[PDB]
Structure formats: structure tokens, C-alpha cells
Amino acid sequence: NPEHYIKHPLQNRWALWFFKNDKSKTWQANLRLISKFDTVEDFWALYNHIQLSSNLMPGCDYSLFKDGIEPMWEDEKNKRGGRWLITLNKQQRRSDLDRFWLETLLCLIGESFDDYSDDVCGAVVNVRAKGDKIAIWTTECENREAVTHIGRVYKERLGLPPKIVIGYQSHADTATKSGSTTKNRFVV
Amino acid sequence: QLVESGGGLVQPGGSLRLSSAISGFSISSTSIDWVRQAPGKGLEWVARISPSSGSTSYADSVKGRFTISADTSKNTVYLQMNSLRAEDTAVYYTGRPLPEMGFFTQIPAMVDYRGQGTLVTVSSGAAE
Secondary structure, eight states, X not given: OGGGTOOOEEEEEEEEEEEEXXXXXXXXHHEEEEXXXXXXXXXXXXXXXXXXXXXXXXXXXXXEEETTSOSBTTSTTTTTOEEEEEEEOXXXXXXXXXXXXXXXXXXXXXXTTGGGGGGEEEEEEEEOXXXXXXXXXXXXXXXXXXXXXXXXXXXXXXXXXXXXXXEEEEHHIIIIIOSTTOOOSEEO | OXXXXXOEEEOXXXXXXXXXXXXXXXXXXXXXXXXXXXXTSOOEEEEEEETTTTEXXXXXXXXXXXXXXXXXXXXXXXEEEOSOOGGGOEEEEEEEEOOBTBBSSSOTTOEEEEOOOEEEEEOOOSOO
């Protein structure tokens, strides 16, 4: 059977990025493409070779974006879009950050959101002193049906109970109107 | 505190230098953005400087015309504004940007500490 020597291709090709916020330097110098992969095998070789999020220095980010979508809000596929925010306190750095990030990676590359997986652009983990965040990025805030389905399934996959609420925030609102004070378009 | 000055009325093609005297933190430490809001329009990122290394970036709308610069001895950033046009008419202020993965440039709302700004008006009109 070819199953013995064939790599298992993923529906999409993904780019893993790294960013360290060194305010002394330019953002292009601070941003690095780690690599692209389009197989299960190539994903695990990469994941096993890099630091866990809980072991990164504060001010460090990882992102996974569909190949062809830049890790930038201005990108055609992101600028009308937004993200589900998972906000972690210092206690959850220890208990949830790594398992939640790997859940997120596999929800993206496993296309776990059914028909609406095409709305998913990528995901981002921010390691900060004041608290860590995981976000799934989708392409369009107006697709209420796709966005709330992605939200519900993410919550179920993470094992968050119904009392715990998460919000979806527009990229344009974040960058352009209200930074940290931007309000949720949706909750789940 | 961030306090900006140097504004007022200028004729098209004229020249201006804005100043932002900064206190509360060193500017060699962090990065500083010029941001502007035309009336009715939304926030627009203008230019960024990292004083420590003196690296700069500009919005496309101002490249070749405006120059951001700084003095760590004075803890002040400047914006030289040459070849001014009507469209440069805006309140111009400084802020410390909070860049992160996906949010690098054109993040004028992504600022913690914020100046009140200085109104710049570019017009060849003779009415208010």
C-alpha cells in the first residue's frame, strides 16, 4: 500500500511566522518566516523543532497563516475580517497556553470548521507579561453564520464550558478606531 | 505627557515643522508614531521613528515630502512637512504604538500614551 511511504497532504499549505517586539528595531527585521508546510509529517517535524509558547520571552508571537495570506491586517483576506480572542492570565500560561495553541494549530490544518474552514485565514499566539492571547483570524466580519460556527466549534474543541464567553473583534476597529478598548461584534 | 506644537495655517507648497516634547519615558527606549485625523476622516498613520537606532518608515501618502526625526538630548520628535497640500489638513499628534503579530503599521488606534495634537490647515482660500 502507498500508505507506507506517501506523506499525508493537508487541504492547505501553511506559513509559520515569529515576531519579537523589539521597539528599538523595524517591524520587518523583527518578523521572520520560520517555514511553510503542506503535510502532517512536515507540520510535526516543524512543531517538535520549535519552543513551546510558554517558554517564549514576553513580547514574542507565533502565527500560522494560509500560504498567500500575509500575517498583516491590511492583507486583502484580513482587512474586512477579525478574530476570536482567547485571553489567558499568568495561571493559564502554565495550564492552558500550550495545549490551547496546539488545539488551534490542528483546528486550522485539520480544517475542523466544516464548510466555513475557508473563512479561516490563520491564528496568532501572543506571549505577554500582562497576559497571553490566542486568536483565530477569519476573512469577513459580515459572514455572521461562518463566524459564530467557527466560534462555537473552537469553544467545544478547547473544552471551554458554556458560562465562559469569548468575543470576535474586527481588525479595522482594532487598528483604526479603538485599540485595546475595541468591542465584540459577536460572543459565543 | 506628549505636547505637540508648530501648526496653524500654511499655503499649498509651503513648509512646517511640528514638535512633540515627550515626558514620562525615554524615546531611545521605545518607538514614536506621528498620526493625523482630517475632519470627517478616520485616524491615519503618518510616520514612525525608533530614536535608539534612527530607523524610520512613512505612510505612502507622505513619502518624499515629510521627514520624522528626534533628539534624545531633548526627548522630542519632529516632523518636517515640505510641499504641503490641502489633503495634509489634519490634527497631527504623537503616540507610542503597541505593534504585535498582524498589527505592525497603519495601527494609529493601537497606541497607549497619546498627545492632544496640533491642527495643521493647508489652504489657498481666504475664508474661515
